[PDB]
Enzyme design. Structure first.
Site, PDB file in Angstrom:
ATOM      1  N   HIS A 697       0.771  -1.246   0.000  1.00  0.00           N
ATOM      2  CA  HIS A 697       0.000   0.000   0.000  1.00  0.00           C
ATOM      3  C   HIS A 697       0.801   1.295   0.000  1.00  0.00           C
ATOM      4  O   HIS A 697       0.354   2.260  -0.620  1.00  0.00           O
ATOM      5  CB  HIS A 697      -0.966   0.025   1.184  1.00  0.00           C
ATOM      6  CG  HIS A 697      -1.801  -1.201   1.283  1.00  0.00           C
ATOM      7  ND1 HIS A 697      -2.965  -1.332   0.567  1.00  0.00           N
ATOM      8  CD2 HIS A 697      -1.592  -2.329   1.996  1.00  0.00           C
ATOM      9  CE1 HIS A 697      -3.437  -2.526   0.873  1.00  0.00           C
ATOM     10  NE2 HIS A 697      -2.642  -3.160   1.731  1.00  0.00           N
ATOM     11  N   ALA A 719      10.447  20.936 -22.978  1.00  0.00           N
ATOM     12  CA  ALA A 719      11.110  21.864 -22.058  1.00  0.00           C
ATOM     13  C   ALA A 719      12.155  22.776 -22.728  1.00  0.00           C
ATOM     14  O   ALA A 719      12.498  23.817 -22.155  1.00  0.00           O
ATOM     15  CB  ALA A 719      11.721  21.110 -20.882  1.00  0.00           C
TER      16      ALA A 719
HETATM   17  N1  LIG Z   1      -4.607 -14.610  11.496  1.00  0.00           N
HETATM   18  C1  LIG Z   1      -5.702 -13.925  11.149  1.00  0.00           C
HETATM   19  N2  LIG Z   1      -6.707 -13.807  12.051  1.00  0.00           N
HETATM   20  C2  LIG Z   1      -7.766 -13.047  11.743  1.00  0.00           C
HETATM   21  N3  LIG Z   1      -8.003 -12.347  10.627  1.00  0.00           N
HETATM   22  C3  LIG Z   1      -7.002 -12.503   9.739  1.00  0.00           C
HETATM   23  C4  LIG Z   1      -5.853 -13.263   9.912  1.00  0.00           C
HETATM   24  N4  LIG Z   1      -5.044 -13.191   8.786  1.00  0.00           N
HETATM   25  C5  LIG Z   1      -5.703 -12.391   7.981  1.00  0.00           C
HETATM   26  N5  LIG Z   1      -6.890 -11.934   8.493  1.00  0.00           N
HETATM   27  C6  LIG Z   1      -7.842 -11.034   7.848  1.00  0.00           C
HETATM   28  O1  LIG Z   1      -7.790 -11.254   6.452  1.00  0.00           O
HETATM   29  C7  LIG Z   1      -7.512 -10.015   5.767  1.00  0.00           C
HETATM   30  C8  LIG Z   1      -6.663 -10.300   4.550  1.00  0.00           C
HETATM   31  O2  LIG Z   1      -5.369 -10.805   4.940  1.00  0.00           O
HETATM   32  P1  LIG Z   1      -4.038  -9.973   4.664  1.00  0.00           P
HETATM   33  O3  LIG Z   1      -2.932 -10.703   5.388  1.00  0.00           O
HETATM   34  O4  LIG Z   1      -4.076  -8.543   5.069  1.00  0.00           O
HETATM   35  O5  LIG Z   1      -3.819 -10.106   3.090  1.00  0.00           O
HETATM   36  P2  LIG Z   1      -3.858  -9.047   1.901  1.00  0.00           P
HETATM   37  O6  LIG Z   1      -3.744  -7.632   2.542  1.00  0.00           O
HETATM   38  O7  LIG Z   1      -2.727  -9.344   0.955  1.00  0.00           O
HETATM   39  O8  LIG Z   1      -5.272  -9.159   1.272  1.00  0.00           O
HETATM   40  C9  LIG Z   1      -6.908  -9.083   6.819  1.00  0.00           C
HETATM   41  O9  LIG Z   1      -7.100  -7.694   6.538  1.00  0.00           O
HETATM   42  C10 LIG Z   1      -7.600  -9.537   8.104  1.00  0.00           C
HETATM   43  O10 LIG Z   1      -8.827  -8.847   8.291  1.00  0.00           O
HETATM   44 MG   LIG Z   2      -3.314  -6.825   4.365  1.00  0.00          MG
END
Ligand SMILES: Nc1ncnc2c1ncn2[C@@H]1O[C@H](COP(=O)(O)OP(=O)(O)O)[C@@H](O)[C@H]1O
Ligand SMILES: [Mg+2]
Ligand SMILES: CC(C)(COP(=O)(O)OP(=O)(O)OC[C@H]1O[C@@H](n2cnc3c(N)ncnc32)[C@H](O)[C@@H]1OP(=O)(O)O)[C@@H](O)C(=O)NCCC(=O)NCCS
Ligand SMILES: CC(C)(COP(=O)(O)OP(=O)(O)OC[C@H]1O[C@@H](n2cnc3c(N)ncnc32)[C@H](O)[C@@H]1OP(=O)(O)O)[C@@H](O)C(=O)NCCC(=O)NCCS
Ligand SMILES: O=P([O-])(O)O
Ligand SMILES: [Mg+2]
EC number: 2.3.3.8
Lengths: 1035, 177, 94
Positions: A697, A719
Site C-alpha cells: 500500500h 522543455a
Molecule cells: N490470522 C488472522 N486472524 C484473523 N483475521 C485474519 C488473519 N489473517 C488475515 N486476516 C484477515 O484477512 C484479511 C486479509 O489478509 P491480509 O494478510 O491482510 O492479506 P492481503 O492484505 O494481501 O489481502 C486481513 O485484513 C484480516 O482482516
Molecule cells: Mg493486508
C-alpha cells in the site's frame, strides 16, 4: 539491491529480533504448505494446528489476497485441507500475471473487531526513513500515502517515542497509545538493525490480550548480506508471482554475489533467435533498445550484462550459460549472438574475450548445428588483442564471426545482424594543480593517471601518495614520461595526510566491505574536499550516512559505484578514460567546450568518443555512479557546468526510473539553466509491459508512468532540451548544437597542439608482436604456466594416476624420461640405503654442530651438505666412472687390478673396515639381489663382481661396498633400461647425476639429525683443547 | 652441491615458508577456539593476510589439481581431519569475498600434516606440537624441492648454458651524489 | 635511422642560423654537388648460390648470422642459410 522477501521469512526475523515491552502474540505460530508437504511431519512440528481455528493464505508475493478470495478465514485443520484441495497446485491469474499456487501459510485465527485493525509502514528514502500510521487498517485502507500520519526519522536520527505519540498515534484509541508506541518504537529498531528498506504491517491487530502481526510486506537491502548473514540466515528472495525462475538465472546470481564484478542475466523468451552478451549496464540497455526499435522485440531472448572487470574464468562461466541456453532447439532462420559493449575503462578486453573464445570452442558443434552468427563490437584495454582472438576462433571453428572496433558505432552491429545494413556547494572540483591520495594498492590506475598528466603537459603528477593497510610504509616505482619516480605508500592514512597537506582529493579503491569506514575516516581530515568512491555494492543505508556527513562537512562525493570522471588537461579519476591510446584517440589531453554527466561508467567512455568526433572535445565529464542514492546527483553537476565559464554546452545521459531528469526541465523553466542542454534517457523499452506490480500500500500510487524513459524524453524535448530521435542520432544532435554555437561566436575553437610523446610499454609491444627480445634463460624440466603443472611433458594428475612415485618423478625431473617401474623402484631403494649412516660422518657432524649452535633447518642442512663431494660422498660417482672407463676400454678385470696398482691408485667402491667375504654388508646384499632379479642386463655389475673376486683374494675385507654397488648398478640401469641412448647415459654420469643420488638421499639423514638435536635440547658445542695440537710459529 | 645450496638458502621466509606458517596460524586459531568467521575478521583487524589462502588464476570453479589430489587422498584415508575441516570453512568465507581466495597447496599440506601428526595415533599432542614447532614442515618442503633444484642443475649443464650477467636495463641505479 | 640523423642536422641549422640542406637515400648521392655549386635547384662454376644454399660460418658472429636468417625469412626461404658455426675456443654447443 533492495530485494523482496516472503511473509514467512519476514515474520520469522520479526518474532526472533523485535525487542519491545509489548507482548507479541502467536510468536512462531506459522506453518508452510507446498504440494510436497507431509501432513504427519507438519503436525509433529506444529501441534498448535489442532489447538484452535486457523487462517490459510498464499505466500507467493501476491498482493490484495483477501480481495481475491485467496484467504480462508476461521477454519479447522480439516477445513483448511478442504480449502486447499481445489487451490494447491492450481493455476491462478492475478491481474496480468498467471502462475501456479505452490506456497501457502497457515496461522492461528485472531478474533478481533474492525476498530482493532491498524496500519504501520516504514520505508527508506534519500533524506531518512518515513514511518506511516493509520487507525483504519485492513483490506480497505486505500491511498495510505495521503490518509496516514507521516513521520520522517532523519538519517543518523533516533525515533523519539514522544513524537510517535504526538504525531503518528493522533487518532489511535487513548488506552492503546502506550502499547502501539512501544511496538512502533521496537519495530523501527528491528527495521534498522536488519537492513530493511520497506516494512509494512497491514493489519496490525491490538486486542485486550496484546499485539498481533497479521500480515507482512518487507524488502531488504540484499547488498547488506555481508553484515546480516548471521541474523538473516538462509534468506531466499522469491521471484515475482507468475514469473517462473530458471536454474541458469540462479547460477549467474550466485557468481555475481561471490565477486566484486557485476554478472546479470534475465531470460525474456528462451525460444527467441536474438541473444545478447553485452559488457556494461548502460550498453546492455542501449543494445536491447536498438533491437526493439528494429522490430526484434518478440525475438529478443535475454537481457543481461557483465562488467566490473570479471576474470577470464568468470567470463567463460557466463558465456557457457548463454551458449548452452541458445543451443536447446533449432530456429528456421538460425540464431544471432551480439557480443557488444562500449569502450571499456578498466575491464581488460583481451582477457575477457579469451574466456568467451574458450566457451565458443567448447560449444562449436552445437553452434554450427544451430546456424549461429556472431557480431562483436568492443573497445577498451587491449581490445586489439581480444579482437584478434575472436576473428581467429571464427576461422578455426567455421562459425561466422564479424569483429568490429571503436571505429564502428556502438549500435551498428544490431542493424548488421538483423540484415538491415551491410557488413563492411563547490563549482570547481579539479585543476591542473590538483593532488590526490589513492586508497588501495592500484598500480595500473596510478600509472594511468600519471601518463594522462604527462600528456596534459602538467608540471607535477596528480598522485601524491597511496594508502595500503597490509604492508609497512614503502616507496613504489612509477614513470613520469620515461623518467622513473617514487611514490610513497603508507600503512596509516593519518601519516599520509600529515606528510601531504597539499592533497585535497581522495580516490577510494576500498572493497564494498572496507569502503564505508575508509570514507568516514577521510572526512576527519578537513584538507580532503572531494572523495571518489569506486566500490559497487555498498548497502544503501551506509551510503545515506556518508552523504549526511559529506553534506555537513562540505566534501563532494563522486560515486559510489563509479569509474569517476575526467577533466581534460587537468585531472582524471583513476581509470576514467582507460589506456593512453584511448585518451589520445578521443583527444582527452586537451579541453573542449562540452561538459557531460552520465550514470554508466562505460557509456561515459563512449560519450568521450562521440563528443570528440562531433565537437571540439570534452571540457569535463562525470559518471555519477549507479547506486540508488549517489553522493552527487545529475542536477548537482549540471549546475556546476552552468556556473563554469569554459562550458559552452551540456550533455546528459539519463536513464529509466527516478525523476532527477525533471529537475533539469524545472531549472530551464526557472531560468537557472541557460546553456544549451542535449539529453537522451536510455531504457525506451519495457515495451514488454512487465509493469513490476506494486509492493504493498505505501509505495502503490505515485506515478510510474512519468519515471519511464519515453515520458522523460518527451517532457525534456518540450522543455527546450535538444533530444535525438534515438541513441544513434545522439552524435548528430550534439554536432548540430556545436555547429550553431561556433556559427554564433559562442565557441572559438583553439588550434591543435601535438601532445608530449610517451614510449610504448614493452608488455604491450610484445603482445602485438611488434618487438622481439631473446630469452636469457632456457628450461626443459617443468612448466608451471599452464592450467596444470607439467613435469617433463607429463601433467601432475597423470603422474599420480600412473602411480610414478618419488622414483618416477625423479626420472622426469632429472632425466626427463618415463622410466620402467623396476628402475623407479631401484632409485627409491638407493635413496633409502643412502638415507643415513650415523652421526660420526663429516656431513652429519657439521649439521649437528650447526643445529647445536642454534641455527635453522636450512642452515644446518647446508652446513653438512657442503662437506659432500670429494673424500665424503664422492665414492658413488668415482666408482661408477672408474669401472665404466675400465670396462669400456676393454681391459679384463685382472689387467684392471694391476693397472691401478701400477698407477698407484686404489679402486673406488672396493674395501670395507669390518665387512668381509665371510661377513657380508646387508645393504649390498639387499641391492645386489634386487638388481639380479629385476634388471634385464647387468654387464658392469658382472665386471665389478669379478674385480671383487680378485681383490678379496688379496685381503678378505676388499669387498664391493654399497658406493661401488650403487655406482655400477646405476650405470647398468641408465645403459640397459632402454630409455637412454649411449651418449645420454654417458652424459648423465659425467654431469654428476650419481652425486645427486647421494646428496638427495643423505639429505634425509641430515634433516633427521637436525630435528633430533633440537628435540634432545642439545647445547652449544666447543671442541676440547686436549684434542687440538697447537703448532704455532716461534715469536 | 654448491648450486643446490645456493638455491636452498632462499627457502625460509617469503619463499617456501608458507607451509610452516599456514600450519602454525591455523593451529593457533583452531586451538584458541575461535570460529572461522571470527578468525577471518581478527586477521583483517590485525592487518594480516591468511597464510595458505589465495591463488593467481585458480579459483573456486577452476580448482588447483595438486590441492585436489591431496585433499581427496586425505579425506579417503585419514581417520579424522579437524584442522583441514576448519581451514576449508575459512576458505568458504574468503572465496565468498574474491573467487581466487582458495586454500592453496602450502595451506593444504600444512593443515593436512598437522592432522596427520595429531590423529594418526603415533604421537602424543606434546610430540605433535613439538615437531611442528621445531620445523618438521620446513623439512618436507626443503627435501621435496631439493629434487627440482638438482633437476635444474643437471638441466643447465646438459643445456650447456653460459655465464649469466643481469642486464643493466632491469636495474634502477639510485646512488648518492 | 638516417631519418632522425637528418633531423638533428636540420635543427642545428635553424638554431644557429647556418644554411643546412639535408637529403636522404631518395636523392642521388652526387646530386648535392650540383645543388651546392648552383647548377641545379635545391628542392669455374656459373651458379654459386640458390634458395637451397647452406653455409658454415667460421667465427663467433651472432649479428651476421642473425642478419642472414632475417634476410632468409623475408625472402620466404623454406630453411635458414646458416647450417653451423665454427669457433675454436668454446666446446661444441647450440
Ligand atoms: N490470522 C488472522 N486472524 C484473523 N483475521 C485474519 C488473519 N489473517 C488475515 N486476516 C484477515 O484477512 C484479511 C486479509 O489478509 P491480509 O494478510 O491482510 O492479506 P492481503 O492484505 O494481501 O489481502 C486481513 O485484513 C484480516 O482482516
Ligand atoms: Mg493486508
Ligand atoms: C572494489 C575493487 C576496486 C577492489 O575489489 P577486490 O579486488 O575484490 O578487493 P581487494 O583487493 O581489497 O580484496 C578483497 C578482499 O580479499 C582479502 N584478501 C586478499 N587476499 C587475502 C588473503 N590471502 N587472506 C585473507 N584475505 C585476503 C582482502 O583483505 C579484501 O578484504 P575486504 O573485502 O574485507 O577488504 C574492485 O572490485 C572493482 O574494481 N570493482 C568494480 C566496481 C565497479 O563496477 N565500479 C564502477 C564502474 S561503473
Ligand atoms: C705383509 C703384511 C704385514 C701386510 O699385508 P696386508 O695388510 O694384507 O697388505 P696391504 O696393506 O699392502 O694390502 C693388500 C693389498 O690390498 C690392496 N688394496 C687395499 N685397499 C685397496 C682398494 N681399495 N682398492 C684396491 N686395492 C686395494 C693394496 O694395494 C695391496 O696390494 P698388493 O698386495 O698387491 O700390494 C701381512 O700380510 C703379514 O702380516 N704377513 C705375514
Ligand atoms: O555497468 P555500467 O553501466 O556502469 O558501465
Ligand atoms: Mg557495472
Amino acid at each position: 539491491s533492495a530485494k523482496a522477501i516472503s511473509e514467512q521469512t519476514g515474520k520469522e526475523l520479526l518474532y526472533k529480533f523485535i525487542c519491545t515491552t509489548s507482548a507479541i502474540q502467536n510468536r512462531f505460530k506459522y506453518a508452510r504448505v507446498t504440494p510436497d508437504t507431509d501432513w504427519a511431519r507438519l503436525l509433529q512440528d506444529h501441534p498448535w494446528l489442532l489447538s484452535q481455528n486457523l487462517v490459510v493464505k498464499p505466500d507467493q508475493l501476491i498482493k490484495r489476497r483477501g480481495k481475491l478470495g485467496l484467504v480462508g478465514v476461521n477454519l479447522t485443520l480439516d477445513g483448511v485441507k478442504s480449502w486447499l484441495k481445489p487451490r494447491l497446485g492450481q493455476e491462478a491469474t492475478v491481474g496480468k500475471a498467471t502462475g501456479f499456487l505452490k506456497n501457502f501459510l497457515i496461522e492461528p485465527f485472531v478474533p478481533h473487531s474492525q476498530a482493532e485493525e491498524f496500519y504501520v509502514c516504514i520505508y527508506a528514502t534519500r533524506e531518512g526513513d518515513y514511518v506511516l500510521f493509520h487507525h483504519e487498517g485492513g483490506v480497505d485502507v486505500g491511498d495510505v500515502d495521503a490518509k496516514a500520519q507521516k513521520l520522517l526519522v532523519g538519517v543518523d536520527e533516533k525515533l523519539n517515542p514522544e513524537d510517535i505519540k504526538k504525531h503518528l498515534l493522533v487518532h489511535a484509541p487513548e488506552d492503546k497509545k502506550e502499547i502501539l508506541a512501544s511496538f512502533i518504537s521496537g519495530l523501527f529498531n528491528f527495521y534498522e538493525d536488519l537492513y530493511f528498506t520497506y516494512l509494512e504491517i497491514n493489519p496490525l491487530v491490538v486486542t485486550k490480550d496484546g499485539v498481533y502481526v497479521l500480515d507482512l510486506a518487507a524488502k531488504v537491502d540484499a547488498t547488506a548480506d555481508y553484515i546480516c548473514k548471521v541474523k538473516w540466515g538462509d534468506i531466499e528472495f522469491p521471484p515475482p508471482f507468475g514469473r517462473e525462475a530458471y536454474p541458469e538465472e540462479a547460477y549467474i546470481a550466485d557468481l555475481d554475489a561471490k565477486s566484486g564484478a557485476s554478472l546479470k542475466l534475465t531470460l525474456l523468451n528462451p525460444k527467441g533467435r536474438i541473444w545478447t552478451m553485452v559488457a556494461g549496464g548502460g550498453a546492455s540497455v542501449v543494445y536491447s533498445d536498438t533491437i526493439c526499435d528494429l522490430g526484434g522485440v518478440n525475438e529478443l531472448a535475454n537481457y543481461g550484462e557483465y562488467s566490473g572487470a570479471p576474470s577470464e574464468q568468470q567470463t567463460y562461466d557466463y558465456a557457457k550459460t548463454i551458449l548452452s541456453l541458445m543451443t536447446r532447439e533449432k530456429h528456421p532462420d538460425g540464431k544471432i549472438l551480439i557480443i557488444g559493449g562500449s569502450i571499456a575503462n578498466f575491464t581488460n578486453v583481451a582477457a575477457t574475450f579469451k574466456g568467451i573464445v574458450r566457451a565458443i570452442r567448447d560449444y562449436q558443434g552445437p553452434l554450427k548445428e544451430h546456424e549461429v552468427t556472431i557480431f562483436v563490437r568492443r573497445g577498451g584495454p587491449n581490445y586489439q588483442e581480444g579482437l584478434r582472438v575472436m576473428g581467429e576462433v571464427g576461422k578455426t571453428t567455421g562459425i561466422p564471426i564479424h569483429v568490429f572496433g571503436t571505429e564502428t558505432h556502438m549500435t551498428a552491429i544490431v542493424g548488421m545482424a538483423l540484415g538491415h545494413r551491410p557488413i563492411p556547494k563547490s563549482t570547481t572540483l579539479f585543476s591542473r594543480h590538483t593532488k590526490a591520495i589513492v586508497w588501495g594498492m592500484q598500480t595500473r590506475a596510478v600509472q594511468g593517471m600519471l601518463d594522462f598528466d604527462y600528456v596534459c603537459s602538467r608540471d607535477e603528477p596528480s598522485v601524491a601518495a597511496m594508502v595500503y593497510p597490509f604492508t609497512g610504509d614503502h616507496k613504489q616505482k612509477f614513470y613520469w614520461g620515461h623518467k622513473e619516480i617514487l611514490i610513497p605508500v603508507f600503512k596509516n592514512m593519518a601519516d599520509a595526510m600529515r606528510k601531504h597537506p597539499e592533497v585535497d582529493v581522495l580516490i577510494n579503491f576500498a572493497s564494498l566491505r572496507s569502503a564505508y569506514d575508509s570514507t568516514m575516516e577521510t572526512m576527519n581530515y578537513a584538507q580532503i574536499r572531494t572523495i571518489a568512491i569506486i566500490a559497487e555494492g555498498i548497502p544503501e543505508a551506509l551510503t545515506r550516512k556518508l552523504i549526511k556527513k559529506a553534506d555537513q562537512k562540505g566534501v563532494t562525493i563522486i560515486g559510489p559505484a563509479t569509474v569517476g570522471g575526467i577533466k581534460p588537461g587537468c585531472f582524471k579519476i583513476g581509470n576514467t578514460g582507460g589506456m593512453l591510446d584511448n585518451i589520445l584517440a578521443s583527444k582527452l589531453y586537451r579541453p573542449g567546450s562540452v561538459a557531460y554527466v552520465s550514470r554508466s561508467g562505460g557509456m561515459s567512455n563512449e560519450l568521450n568518443n562521440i563528443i570528440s568526433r562531433t565537437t571540439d572535445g570534452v571540457y569535463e565529464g562525470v559518471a555519477i555512479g549507479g547506486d540508488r542514492y549517489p553522493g552527487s546527483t545529475f542536477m548537482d553537476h549540471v549546475l556546476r557546468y552552468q556556473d563554469t565559464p569554459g562550458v559552452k554546452m551540456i550533455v546528459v545521459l539519463g536513464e529509466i526510473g527516478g525523476t532527477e531528469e525533471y529537475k533539469i526541465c524545472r531549472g530551464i523553466k526557472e531560468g537557472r539553466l541557460t546553456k544549451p542542454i542535449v539529453c537522451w534517457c536510455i531504457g525506451t523499452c519495457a515495451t514488454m509491459f512487465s509493469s513490476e506490480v506494486q509492493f504493498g500500500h505505501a509505495g502503490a500510487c505515485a506515478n510510474q508512468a512519468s519515471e519511464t524513459a519515453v515520458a522523460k524524453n518527451q517532457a525534456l524535448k518540450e522543455a527546450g532540451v535538444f533530444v535525438p530521435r534515438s541513441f544513434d542520432e545522439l552524435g548528430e544532435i550534439i554536432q548540430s548544437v556545436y555547429e550553431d554555437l561556433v556559427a554564433n561566436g559562442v565557441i572559438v575553437p583553439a588550434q591543435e597542439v601535438p601532445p608530449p610523446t610517451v614510449p610504448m610499454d614493452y608488455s604491450w609491444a610484445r603482445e602485438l608482436g611488434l618487438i622481439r627480445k631473446p630469452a636469457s634463460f632456457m628450461t626443459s624440466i617443468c612448466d608451471e604456466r599452464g592450467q596444470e603443472l607439467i613435469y617433463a611433458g607429463m601433467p601432475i594428475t597423470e603422474v599420480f594416476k600412473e602411480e610414478m612415485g618419488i622414483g618416477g618423478v625423479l626420472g622426469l625431473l632429472w632425466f626427463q624420461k618415463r622410466l620402467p617401474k623396476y628402475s623407479c623402484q631401484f632409485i627409491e631403494m638407493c635413496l633409502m640405503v643412502t638415507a643415513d649412516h650415523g652421526p660420526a660422518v663429516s656431513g652429519a657432524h657439521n649439521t649437528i654442530i650447526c643445529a647445536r649452535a642454534g641455527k635453522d633447518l636450512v642452515s644446518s642442512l647446508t652446513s653438512g651438505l657442503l662437506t659432500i663431494g670429494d673424500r665424503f660422498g664422492g665414492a658413488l660417482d668415482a666408482a661408477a666412472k672408474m669401472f665404466s672407463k675400465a670396462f669400456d676400454s676393454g681391459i679384463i678385470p685382472m689387467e684392471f687390478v694391476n693397472k691401478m696398482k701400477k698407477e698407484g691408485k686404489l679402486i673406488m667402491g672396493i674395501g670395507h673396515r669390518v665387512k668381509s667375504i665371510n661377513n657380508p654388508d646387508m645393504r649390498v646384499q639387499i641391492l645386489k639381489d634386487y638388481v639380479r632379479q629385476h634388471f634385464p642386463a647387468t654387464p658392469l655389475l658382472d665386471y665389478a663382481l669379478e674385480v671383487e673376486k680378485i681383490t678379496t683374494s688379496k685381503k678378505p675385507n676388499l669387498i664391493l661396498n654399497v658406493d661401488g654397488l650403487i655406482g655400477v648398478a646405476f650405470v647398468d640401469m641408465l645403459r640397459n633400461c632402454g630409455s637412454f641412448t649411449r651418449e645420454e647415459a654417458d652424459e648423465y654420469i659425467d654431469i654428476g647425476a650419481l652425486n645427486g643420488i647421494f646428496v638427495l638421499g643423505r639429505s634425509m639423514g641430515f634433516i633427521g639429525h637436525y630435528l633430533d638435536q633440537k628435540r634432545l635440547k642439545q647445547g652449544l658445542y666447543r671442541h676440547p683443547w686436549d684434542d687440538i695440537s697447537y703448532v704455532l710459529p716461534e715469536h
